[PDB]
Amino acid sequence: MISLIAALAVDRVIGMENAMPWNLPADLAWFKRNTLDKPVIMGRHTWESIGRPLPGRKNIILSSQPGTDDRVTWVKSVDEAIAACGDVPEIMVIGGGRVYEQFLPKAQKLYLTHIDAEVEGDTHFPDYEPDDWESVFSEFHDADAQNSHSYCFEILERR
Ligand SMILES: NC(=O)C1=CN([C@@H]2O[C@H](COP(=O)(O)OP(=O)(O)OC[C@H]3O[C@@H](n4cnc5c(N)ncnc54)[C@H](OP(=O)(O)O)[C@@H]3O)[C@@H](O)[C@H]2O)C=CC1
Ligand SMILES: Cc1cc(CSC(=N)NC(=N)N)c(C)cc1CSC(=N)NC(=N)N
Ligand SMILES: [Mn+2]
Ligand SMILES: [Mn+2]
């Protein structure tokens, strides 16, 4: 199964200048929790945004140009990326925008962090068809001393 995981601000903004224009420790925790011990697929800009392999997960980078770091696995197509994961129960697509778009249709699950924050962005999560998804998990949280925004974790499964 292929899953997409992301954090969306208002208007589905997910990034600005290769970065997440917010500070939410709780979302990073949720991310580590739902990706640990699973292969992660990401675009190259998203690879450069992190600078180092995510610990305890197989890192697959999608790029049309030759790979430049052997600490990770480089692939040149969606199909090679999926094949590179082998036989695992779940494949986590962690971004960015152009990669989400490509993997969305093969997706069976969406892990979304809805952040109540307005932020100018240059990158947006795909405009998915709400009718095709079913909310199977929803957990809302008010802002607190560590997390400056109210946010909600949601898991959608393709109907
Ligand atoms: N808020 C959230 O949850 C998230 C936010 N982000 C944010 O997303 C933004 C980066 O997103 P964006 O610019 O779209 O970039 P991506 O990370 O999606 O990078 C895309 C790059 O990877 C390669 N690639 C993608 N698809 C293919 C394919 N099918 N075949 C071959 N190569 C492919 C290409 O690199 P090449 O040029 O080498 O061909 C392409 O330019 C940043 O702003 C980041 O901070 C990212 C993940 C989650
Ligand atoms: C650390 C990091 C992780 C990601 C992947 S996050 C994700 N797919 N899902 C989710 N958050 N729930 C991304 C896209 C970017 C980063 C680094 S962000 C950053 N560097 N911000 C900044 N420079 N201030
Ligand atoms: Mn049901
Ligand atoms: Mn069904």
Task: Determine the distance separating the centroid of ligand 4 and the alpha carbon of 105, expressed in angstroms.
Answer: 16
Resolution, rounded to a tenth of an Å? 2.1
CB 118 within 8 A of CB 150: no
Retrieve residue 74's tokens.
């480089």
Indicate the burial class of 124 (C-beta count within 10 angstroms; 0-12, 13-18, 19 or more). middle
d(CA 63, CA 99): 10
Annotated binding residue 33: no
Kindly report the CA angle at 143 between 155 and 130, in degrees rounded to 5? 30
43 lines ligand 1 (CB under 6 A): yes
Domain residue extents for the chain:
1-159
- Name, in order, each residue with C-beta under 8 angstroms of 67's C-beta and a sequence gap of 6 or more: 61, 73, 74
What architecture is domain 1-159? 3-Layer(aba) Sandwich (3.40)
